[PDB]
Amino acid sequence: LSKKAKASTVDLPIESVSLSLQDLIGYFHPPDEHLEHEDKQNRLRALKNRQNLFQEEGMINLVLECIDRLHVYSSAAHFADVAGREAGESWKSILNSLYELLAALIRGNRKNCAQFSGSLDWLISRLERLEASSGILEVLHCVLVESPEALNIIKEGHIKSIISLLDKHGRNHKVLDVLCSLCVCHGVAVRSNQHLICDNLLPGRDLLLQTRLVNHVSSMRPNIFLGVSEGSAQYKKWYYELMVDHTEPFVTAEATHLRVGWASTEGYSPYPGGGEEWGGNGVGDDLFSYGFDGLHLWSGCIARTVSSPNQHLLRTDDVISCCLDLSAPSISFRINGQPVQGMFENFNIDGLFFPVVSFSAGIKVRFLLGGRHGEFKFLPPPGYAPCYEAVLPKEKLKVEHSREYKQERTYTRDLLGPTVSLTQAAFTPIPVDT
Amino acid sequence: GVEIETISPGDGRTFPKKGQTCVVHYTGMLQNGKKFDSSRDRNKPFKFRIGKQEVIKGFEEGAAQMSLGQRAKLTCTPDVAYGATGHPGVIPPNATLIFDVELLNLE
Amino acid sequence: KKSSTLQQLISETMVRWAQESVIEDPELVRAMFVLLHRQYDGIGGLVRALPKTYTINGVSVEDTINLLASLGQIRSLLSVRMGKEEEKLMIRGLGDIMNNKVFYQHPNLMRALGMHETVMEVMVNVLGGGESKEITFPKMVANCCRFLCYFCRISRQNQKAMFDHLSYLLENSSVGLASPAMRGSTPLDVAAASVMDNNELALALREPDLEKVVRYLAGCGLQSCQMLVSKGYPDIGWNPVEGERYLDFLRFAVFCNGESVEE
Amino acid sequence: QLILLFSRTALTEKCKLEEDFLYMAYADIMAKSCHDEEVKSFEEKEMEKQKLLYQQARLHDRGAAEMVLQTISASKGETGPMVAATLKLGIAILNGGNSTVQQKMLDYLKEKKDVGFFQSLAGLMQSCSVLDLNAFERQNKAEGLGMVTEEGSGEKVLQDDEFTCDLFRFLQLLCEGHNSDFQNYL
Amino acid sequence: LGVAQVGRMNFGKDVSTLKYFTICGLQEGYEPFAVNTNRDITMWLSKRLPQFLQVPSNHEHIEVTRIDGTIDSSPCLKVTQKSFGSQNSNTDIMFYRLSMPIECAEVFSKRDDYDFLMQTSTYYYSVRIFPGQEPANVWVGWITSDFHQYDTGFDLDRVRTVTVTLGDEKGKVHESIKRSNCYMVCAGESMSPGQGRNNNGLEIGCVVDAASGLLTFIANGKELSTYYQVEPSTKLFPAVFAQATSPNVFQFELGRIKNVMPLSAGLFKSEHKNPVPQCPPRLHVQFLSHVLWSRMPNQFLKVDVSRISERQGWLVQCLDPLQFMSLHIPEENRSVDILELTEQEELLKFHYHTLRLYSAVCALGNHRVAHALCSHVDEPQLLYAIENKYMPGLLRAGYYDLLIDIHLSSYATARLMMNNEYIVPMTEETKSITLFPDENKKHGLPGIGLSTSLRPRMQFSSPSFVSISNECYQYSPEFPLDILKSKTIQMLTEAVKEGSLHARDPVGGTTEFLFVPLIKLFYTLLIMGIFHNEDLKHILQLIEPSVFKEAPKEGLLQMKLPEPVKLQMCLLLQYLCDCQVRHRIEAIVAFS
């Protein structure tokens, strides 16, 4: 076929090769564990003698030649075009069966793995191929676990090739197992292999999953829902204050989280959107929340430093004033009565807005909502209104958890279904046509 | 090479000086935001002595520019930190190092 | 009725586990019966322990601790595969051991610790790695053989300990014969130091090892040195450089303490 | 369970018979339990015979004969302390010409078709040591020189006499009682 | 639970709480669900926010087929709908994403030519809108990881945007920055000529400049007016949103236009300098879906809210620290709690093998590698992994083994190596040593007493990476041993007094996972000799109360243990007997 003889002229025994490969794989089959111990010993002896005879007759080299002369064709469609349709159909299965037969022949045989140590370099060259990746990894694992000589043969380029396979083909644990076999074999540690695998795989932090302990963060909001819509009786300017009565910078190893600002619901539902109910997320970690930590403006989990007189992280005896202007989308902050040289502007105004503070442990902060609920230490800017005015006449204003679930007894916990939309939150009198 | 911005103010009159060990309690992070070192994790304040090449350059100049009791954010360019060879297994080659450092005390 | 002691408690719990359940784990069964036999044979523990026991005065505590740390490094490096940094570590540790005074002062402690076994195990690994293709890491074999020769010269019983391994050394007698400046650092020299100036050991020498040495000398006489001709020396038939060292070993075997061992 | 563990370890395929302190110690323990060693009367002679029969039964009911045969076969003709302990255990279980143990050993050998047992037996008997005038003369010359002996026994001549006696006593016990079938089978 | 519905489950953790169990169900024989459990049952609920996941092979509506790149055609991913052409076919906005993101520059700047192609950071992919698919129904562009917005109708106006304006003291806008999760364009408005896209093509090209952060779109060879400027370090995912009107809807193409690096180079670090387009198996099409589960945390923050006064206002207070482990997926740029790996099996198995790889690289005294791994797996993470009850058993065992290998393994091995040989200095304490503590012949508690035998010195280096000294890499990394001792004793006591109750849910899910790591860490500490005096007394009480009581409840010996735990206790008894032998040797020397 390589010399391009006509397809009918050449005889390609596809079916016989496939059946013989299946029979040989079954013939080189490890004993089952549930069998009696002495019978298992007999079957293991038979398998070992079988492998020894095959290796002495040189079956491994013939299998390798078949594998190479099938690998010369890249794809099943290519091999079908070269030889024929049925050959193209059977190409992948034949390659897989040949690789499995090689693995079965060499598995558990110290001598066979010792001879395959020399040819293993050729094997790794086809690692990147999708059709042969699994079989090559299986053969490599067997050879590495059995023969320390092939472990010595393994080099830095081959280690990089295996790591590149981990990168290209995704997360496959067999690659990690092969790497562990490279690191340690027969109770003997290869320092060079360990150092190389470390220095290549670990510092990138791009493949292995990364772990961290993260402080739990909770959100704290009032009842008020503030939305602006065309033809609605909602005042567009609002103002509230928060003072840090007490804060501890480091309750744990991680820094204490403390962010204050406004957040917007998704649609008209009372449920805040865009953020997970539990986790390290807080105000400004999603595009529905807008926060200030005393040094940065937080929005969409991205922080940008803002300048302010005596700028510092939020500490004890700091009065934070947040201003929401929905006539033109604007969120401005003032620390200790001094303006903060930054704003949020041109954000989405479809949903209702509410004050919110996100915090880790070790805080003590108080809402100054204006009017009866709180008092403003700094006068609100002209045109703005205290947030306590937004409370509906019938309801009462509390500060309640923004998310549905809080700490309580497991059986007393109220499981909540989906909530109805807050149609009454925005009052729009629609004209009746007359 | 190193730029410093204050997270928390210090006294502003006591500064590191020759032959005085600096007790710093720091947290190190890569520029992309992945933590690689933290003395707060080990619960051991870090002690180093100025002018004796014990720590990396950018860290040394940042600590020198800091004042007693001042918490500041240190940004170290690759030249003043591990160069282009990097730290094997921890710091990738040509990496910018960000440090949150607090000068607890000076003996 | 209470066991009231660890021995009785262990015996009862082992027998109770074994009678309660058929145990599929061979390692668990082995460990259980080892523990049971240990509990029943209290005397055997002392029998094994007392030879390992050694007594040192308070003056030697510090250098004994340093030498034990060096020996611990050498032992821990057995589990690791050979390399350049490992070679440097072996060499530095053996140098420290030979430098320390306790090595000279307390040979019996040193035999009980068994450094000779550990050092020859290191050398066995080095030689078994690439024996046909010339011993990789020759500085390893040189330092190990020098340390073993010094160990031989330390005491007469150390010659006992090294002669117990004479068979393997004469097997790998052709490690560094050709290379000059390796004299005193060959397993042949280790064997010569083991059998040197000891009438008892010369008498205990057998015939087959002498046959093997004579065969090596005959091969040297028959064939030249491939390594030497590779370096480019003219190829004369026989090999004086490797012949002479075998002749020296035979001389040490036959002649001892100014009198010829006639057998 | 211990006997099964030892039997499985012996049946396991490996080039050497790896030295096992546990096997040697427990084999010695069981052999001593079996043998448990002024004219005796007939009543008390039959007493001691029944007691020895019960002691041997406690083992050969659990597979001690198969242990001994498997360990000797796996020895592959190499003398060792494990082989000596196995031979002593076999002597203990076969002492007095135990017909049941002889029958079990013969049945096991015939059904396994173990050529390794007899090959190892031939190797052990070939490798058994004898008197050496050369070693005797060397020892005498050391004594004449007056150098202090390292071992007072002087076991260099007749290296393993106890082992040789144990092996031939094992064969005699196997053939004891005019066991004609086993005599022909040997 | 339906709309505006509230309900409670009582699993019977406290039987008295069950209202009608005694009335019905108690006498019949039914048991409470949580009668034997020692911990509250972890409760799972449907996830409100959709997350992108790979299209299942059995997904009834959407099918994705991969076309291998030929010599003349670039590698291509084709999305087609099998459900269409028949009833029950779903006509809705379906959001598609490529798995891996292109990373912008950390700091932005102030025949194809090989040099420019090599030096450039510009990347390209194109999508071919198949004939018969309405271009207005298809949107093409980039989305970030924050895009969790799923709606029946998607409009480019709805995309969530924010502008962060930073000003100077005067108030001048020195930087105005636009931020959005979605950067996409519409093929319907893109097509200028009209209906005639079904003739061929409608290739909408997306061009990203990583160095500058500029996002430009080309359509049929002309540069579109739409352009987006993204912030530095933004991770952008190739995404196409399409409402399917045809069985064949859109096709990702990974080709390269003149002077532009293909997408594979930007995606894969290894192929950063490879100009040939590539579609490695890791890259795959992901679609937004709501079929996911969320785990409610076992413990929440203690937050107290109250109105202090008319004067003072509402106060919110939280003073107790609650902390959790987050597992961060690098390619998808999302972090999840590792306790979710109980139900995510693939990530669980991969992380277990990763822990095994860490153990392998740090195995057998590789102190430098242990110091390096101290950065990746930290002390707080290790301690939380040791102490947390709900973690999977595989990760529990992996973290226990990793802690042992990084910190305790080297010195434990050294002491095990020195266990056999005894070197006893001649000192006053040595002379004072005696076989029996008092006149009456009663054995002292094993391991408690005065031992003078020479033993390896315990020395630990302090992990630190600001330091440049090379002495730290020699010696094992340092771990707080008193805290480990106290936690080991406390959790061993808890495990002992819980195992007797035979709870349905042990820590880690099985008795083996509960005990083998704990007993292994305890045995390592005992070998190291960290335990001293009263701690070892409590240890001996836990192992067996009656035998080791200093002069009912059943100890760790008499509790029907599994075989691996039996082996661990066999090792412990070995060590105790070795301690007895060492005491005998010391007393022999003292008499001598």
Q: Give the DSSP per-residue string, chain C.
A: ----SHHHHHHHHHHHHHHH-----HHHHHHHHHHHHHHH-HHHHHHHHHHH-EEEEGGGHHHHHHHHHHHHHHHHHHHBPP-HHHHHHHHHHHHHHHHSSHHHH-HHHHHHHTHHHHHHHHHHHHHHTTSTT--SSHHHHHHHHHHHHHHHHH-HHHHHHHHTTHHHHHHTTTSSSSSTT-TT-SHHHHHHHHSTT-HHHHHH--SHHHHHHHHHHHHHHHS--HHHHHHT----SS-HHHHHHHHHHHHHHHEETTEE---
Rounded Cα distance between C238 and C249, Å, is: 19
Which chain E residue has the Cα nearest residue A217? E301
Catalytic residues of B: 26, 36-37, 56, 82, 99
Residue A118 CB: number of other CB atoms within 10 A?
11
Burial of A126 (0-12, 13-18, 19+ CB in 10 A): middle
Paired with B72 in beta bridges are B6, B101
Tell me the two tokens of residue C88: 């440097």
A102-105 own/partner pairs: CB under 8 Å, 24+ apart: A102/A60, A102/A63, A102/A64, A102/A67, A102/A135, A102/A139, A103/A135, A103/A138, A103/A139, A103/A142, A104/A25, A104/A28, A104/A29, A105/A28, A105/A51, A105/A54, A105/A55, A105/A59, A105/A60, A105/A63
Helix, coil or strand: residue D75: helix
Rounded Cα distance between E316 and A358, Å, is: 11
Instruction: Please name the member of A199, A210, A312 whose beta carbon is closest to the beta carbon of B89.
Output: A199
What is the maximal distance between C-alpha atoms in chain D? 59
Distance from the Cα of residue A37 to its chain's centroid: 46
Helix, coil or strand: residue E67: strand
Rounded Cα distance between E153 and A287, Å, is: 20
Asked if residues E279 and E43 have their Cβ atoms less than 8 Å apart, the reply is no
Instruction: Please name the member of E425, E456, E581 whose beta carbon is closest to the beta carbon of C58.
Output: E425
Distance in Å from the first CA to the final CA of chain E: 82
Rounded Cα distance between A290 and A3, Å, is: 70
Closest CA to E106 of C119, B33, B41: B33
Instruction: Tell whether D133 is within 8 A of chain C (Cβ).
Output: no
Rounded Cα distance between E588 and E592, Å, is: 6
Letter string b/e over residues E159-180, b meaning 16 or more CB atoms within 10 A of that residue's CB: bbbbbbbbbeeeeeeeeebebb
Which chain E residue has the Cα nearest residue C4? E547
Residue C94 CB: number of other CB atoms within 10 A?
22
Rounded Cα distance between C225 and C178, Å, is: 8
Burial of C109 (0-12, 13-18, 19+ CB in 10 A): buried
Paired with B8 in beta bridges are B71
Residue with tokens 């570590």: C89
Strand order in the sheet with E334-337: A210-215, E323-329, E334-337
Asked if residues E386 and E487 have their Cβ atoms less than 8 Å apart, the reply is yes
Asked if residues A314 and A355 have their Cβ atoms less than 8 Å apart, the reply is no
**E111 CB contacts (<8 Å, ≥6 apart)?**
none
Asked if the Cβ–Cβ distance from C85 to A190 is below 8 Å, we say no
Q: Which chain C residues are within 8 Å of E570, Cβ to Cβ?
A: 28, 31-32, 35
Which chain D residue has the Cα nearest residue A43? D13
Alpha helix segments (H runs only) across E44-196: 114-119, 187-190
Burial of A239 (0-12, 13-18, 19+ CB in 10 A): buried
Q: Which chain E residues are within 8 Å of B42, Cβ to Cβ?
A: 379, 462-463, 478
Asked if residues A177 and E353 have their Cβ atoms less than 8 Å apart, the reply is yes
Rounded Cα distance between E453 and E119, Å, is: 67
Paired with E173 in beta bridges are E167
Q: Which run of H or of E encompasses E418?
A: helix E409-418
Closest CA to A293 of A305, A281, A279: A305
Closest CA to E294 of E96, E94, E50: E50
Instruction: Tell whether C29 is within 8 A of chain D (Cβ).
Output: yes
Interface probe, candidates C33, C37, C41, C43, chain D, greatest D C-beta count within 10 A: C33
Asked if residues A226 and E337 have their Cβ atoms less than 8 Å apart, the reply is no
Going from the C-alpha of E544 to that of each of E445, E448, E573, E582, the distances in angstroms are 12, 16, 11, 22
Residue B3 CB: number of other CB atoms within 10 A?
12
Going from the C-alpha of E397 to that of each of E359, E387, E508, E516, the distances in angstroms are 11, 12, 9, 8
Residue C4, amino acid: S
- Residue B102 backbone phi and psi in degrees, to 5: -125, 125
Going from the C-alpha of D162 to that of each of D70, D135, D142, the distances in angstroms are 22, 19, 25
What is the full DSSP assignment across E290-343? ---EEEPPSS----EEEE--TTT-EEEEE-S--EEEEEEETTTTEEEEGGGGGT
Rounded Cα distance between E299 and C150, Å, is: 68
Going from the C-alpha of A65 to that of each of A102, A123, D36, the distances in angstroms are 12, 12, 68
Helix, coil or strand: residue E438: coil
What experimental approach yielded this model? cryo-EM
Q: Which run of H or of E encompasses A88?
A: helix A85-106
Strands E476-477 and E460-461 turn out to be parallel
Q: Which chain E residues are within 8 Å of B36, Cβ to Cβ?
A: 375, 465
Residue C49 CB: number of other CB atoms within 10 A?
18
Rounded Cα distance between E13 and E307, Å, is: 35
Asked if the Cβ–Cβ distance from E585 to C46 is below 8 Å, we say yes
Tell me the two tokens of residue D32: 């001593």
Rounded Cα distance between E412 and E265, Å, is: 47
Residue with tokens 């060292």: C245
Distance in Å from the first CA to the final CA of chain C: 68
Sequence-ordered strand ranges (E) for A191-301: 210-215, 218-222, 237-247, 258-264, 289-292, 296-299
Closest CA to E545 of E535, E534, E559, E555: E555
What is the CA angle C81-C85-C89, rounded to 5?
90
Rounded Cα distance between E61 and E86, Å, is: 11
Asked if residues C195 and C202 have their Cβ atoms less than 8 Å apart, the reply is yes
Going from the C-alpha of B99 to that of each of A172, A383, B43, E72, the distances in angstroms are 35, 43, 17, 50
Residue E439 CB: number of other CB atoms within 10 A?
6
Closest CA to A323 of A308, A301, A345, A304: A345
What is the CA angle A411-A416-A417, rounded to 5?
140
Tell me the two tokens of residue A192: 């060079």
Q: Which run of H or of E encompasses E252?
A: strand E248-253
Tell me the two tokens of residue E265: 């180079």
Rounded Cα distance between A131 and A116, Å, is: 21
Residue A255 CB: number of other CB atoms within 10 A?
17
What is the CA angle A374-A375-A379, rounded to 5?
140
Going from the C-alpha of E537 to that of each of C135, E444, E451, E482, E544, the distances in angstroms are 54, 11, 17, 16, 11
Rounded Cα distance between E247 and A241, Å, is: 56
Asked if residues A386 and A239 have their Cβ atoms less than 8 Å apart, the reply is yes
Asked if residues A229 and A327 have their Cβ atoms less than 8 Å apart, the reply is no
Residue A29 CB: number of other CB atoms within 10 A?
11
Rounded Cα distance between E473 and E470, Å, is: 6
Q: Supply the angle between the helices A85-106 and A14-27 in degrees, to the nearest 10.
A: 20
Asked if the Cβ–Cβ distance from A188 to C86 is below 8 Å, we say no
Residue E431 CB: number of other CB atoms within 10 A?
13
Rounded Cα distance between A224 and A235, Å, is: 13
Residue C210 exposure: Cα atoms within 13 Å on the Cβ side? 13
Rounded Cα distance between E57 and E63, Å, is: 7
3+ Cβ–Cβ pairs closer than 8 Å linking C and E: yes
Tell me the two tokens of residue D143: 């004594």
Going from the C-alpha of E53 to that of each of A32, A433, E62, E98, E344, the distances in angstroms are 39, 49, 13, 10, 13
D60-65 own/partner pairs: CB under 8 Å, 24+ apart: D60/D93, D60/D98, D60/D100, D60/D101, D60/D104, D62/D3, D63/D3, D63/D4, D63/D7, D64/D3, D64/D30, D64/D89, D64/D93, D64/D101, D65/D90, D65/D93, D65/D101, D65/D104, D65/D105, D65/D108
Rounded Cα distance between C56 and A108, Å, is: 50
Interface probe, candidates E367, E416, E423, E577, chain C, greatest C C-beta count within 10 A: E423
Residue with tokens 């002292």: E444
What is the full DSSP assignment across C81-108? PP-HHHHHHHHHHHHHHHHSSHHHH-HH
**E161 CB contacts (<8 Å, ≥6 apart)?**
A287, A346, A347, A348, E178, E179, E180
Instruction: Please name the member of A37, A44, A45 whose beta carbon is closest to the beta carbon of D8.
Output: A37
Asked if residues E191 and E170 have their Cβ atoms less than 8 Å apart, the reply is no
Residue A282 CB: number of other CB atoms within 10 A?
27
- Residue A281 backbone phi and psi in degrees, to 5: -70, 145
Residue C241 CB: number of other CB atoms within 10 A?
16
Rounded Cα distance between A101 and A90, Å, is: 16
Q: Which run of H or of E encompasses E566?
A: helix E563-591
Letter string b/e over residues D42-79, b meaning 16 or more CB atoms within 10 A of that residue's CB: eeeeeeeeeebeebbbebbebbbbbbbbbbbbbbebeb
Closest CA to E564 of E393, E369, E327: E393
Reported residue count of chain A is 434
What is the maximal distance between C-alpha atoms in chain E? 110
Q: Which run of H or of E encompasses A302?
A: strand A302-305
Rounded Cα distance between A133 and A111, Å, is: 24
Tell me the two tokens of residue D118: 């007899």
Strands E261-262 and E122-128 turn out to be parallel
Tell me the two tokens of residue E126: 């194109």
Asked if residues A331 and A324 have their Cβ atoms less than 8 Å apart, the reply is yes
Tell me the two tokens of residue A115: 């001879």
**B83 CB contacts (<8 Å, ≥6 apart)?**
none
Closest CA to E33 of E23, E49, E18: E18
Q: Supply the angle between the helices C6-20 and E563-591 in degrees, to the nearest 10.
A: 160
Residue A107 CB: number of other CB atoms within 10 A?
20
Residue with tokens 């087929």: E65
Burial of A186 (0-12, 13-18, 19+ CB in 10 A): exposed
Asked if residues D72 and D83 have their Cβ atoms less than 8 Å apart, the reply is yes
